[PDB]
């Protein structure tokens, strides 16, 4: 299947409590493989997957330098954006950044991306052509003019559709024994009366990888769009994921409902009936 490499960065100002908190994480697909946390003891980029540990000391030094430069750049940007948005120095604010690339199953480049946020809202994003920016408001447009003048998109593009792809291919080879595994969901349904007259049906998907999945309830084949409770997909903590979906039904009518389970590891979509 296709694969992705993504880095996520969060910087949070803490006025009067020292320098901003800074957390960086790198993922291949849904598997974390490196982290940096400004409050951790080592002050180094650190491995989080077995197949990255073989990288040499020059790699860990370079990744540490480059994540610390990202941190220092965010620290400056926190102060700049506070000015653009006419905010005071007293409040805590947040910058989030995600970037990365996707490749196909034969390794070809598919897509590159970079998006930035301020206080949990869009700030600026690189467009899919990797040549243009889209600013979310008139403050962010100041950054866009700066980045246009600096020819930042061209530099970033050489990474997102070149360097990023080259490293992602190396990691997929480093990690082949585990990154090319897909685990299909193990599924079952449970039934819980909530009174003499109604019961909760809950459709369960467990042990699946990657995280992407769809659970939907039907009643006589009609999608029960509302009336369904659906939790966020969640990590088991062993590298796999879990999800459930529930519906409240009249006692005696359970067999009119079906749960439908779609996951890239399933050969056919699964239908469950109580």
């Amino acid at each position: 299947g296709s694969h992705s490499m993504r880095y996520f960065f969060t910087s949070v100002s803490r006025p009067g409590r020292g320098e901003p908190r800074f957390i960086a994480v790198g993922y291949v697909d849904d598997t974390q493989f490196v982290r940096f946390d400004s409050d951790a003891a080592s002050q180094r980029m650190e491995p989080r997957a077995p197949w990255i540990e073989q990288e040499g000391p020059e790699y860990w030094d370079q990744e540490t330098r480059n994540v610390k430069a990202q941190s220092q750049t965010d620290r400056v940007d926190l102060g700049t954006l506070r000015g653009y948005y006419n905010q005071s120095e007293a409040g805590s604010h947040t910058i989030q950044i995600m970037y990365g690339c996707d490749v196909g199953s034969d390794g070809r480049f598919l897509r590159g991306y970079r998006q930035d946020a301020y206080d949990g809202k869009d700030y600026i994003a690189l467009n899919e052509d990797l040549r243009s920016w889209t600013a979310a408001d008139m403050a962010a447009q100041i950054t866009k003019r700066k980045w246009e003048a600096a020819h930042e998109a061209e530099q970033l593009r050489a990474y997102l559709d070149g360097t990023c792809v080259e490293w992602l291919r190396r990691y997929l080879e480093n990690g082949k024994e585990t990154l090319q595994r897909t685990d299909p969901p193990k599924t079952h349904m449970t039934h819980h009366p909530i009174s003499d007259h109604e019961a909760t049906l809950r459709c369960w998907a467990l042990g699946f990888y990657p995280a992407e999945i769809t659970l939907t309830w039907q009643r006589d084949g009609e999608d029960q769009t509302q009336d369904t409770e659906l939790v966020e997909t969640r990590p088991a903590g062993d590298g796999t994921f879990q999800k459930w979906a529930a519906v409240v039904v009249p006692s005696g009518e359970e067999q009119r409902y079906t749960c439908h389970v779609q996951h890239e590891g399933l050969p056919k979509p699964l239908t469950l009936r109580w």
Partner: peptide, 9 residues
Amino acid sequence: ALHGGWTTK
């Protein structure tokens, strides 16, 4: 691996 080089906003 991370991108290097940083244009401030």
